[PDB]
């Protein structure tokens, strides 16, 4: 369903809905499409689209 990923670099909140995340930050994926998955910021429940490049899976 929703896997957990960690940001390797800050995203860049440019869109009004994009979820901003920083490097080393942990995020929860809810629906990974094919290039931009919408994760949730553990900071305080932030939900926004995250790029499939900045963040990486907890594994590799």
């Amino acid at each position: 369903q929703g896997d957990i990923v960690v940001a390797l670099y800050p995203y860049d909140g440019i869109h009004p809905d994009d979820l901003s995340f920083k490097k080393g930050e942990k995020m929860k994926v809810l629906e990974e499409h094919g290039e931009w998955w919408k994760a949730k910021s553990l900071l305080t429940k932030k939900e926004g689209f995250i790029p499939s490049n900045y963040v990486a899976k907890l594994n590799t």
Binding site: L8, Y9, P10, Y11, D12, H15, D17, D18, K23, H33, G34, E35, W36, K38, F49, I50, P51, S52, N53, Y54
Partner: peptide, 22 residues
Amino acid sequence: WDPGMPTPPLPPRPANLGERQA
């Protein structure tokens, strides 16, 4: 080291994926 501030380019967003809602 020296810099300490990396950041790869993001994806393109299929049909405004990470852009707007749908």
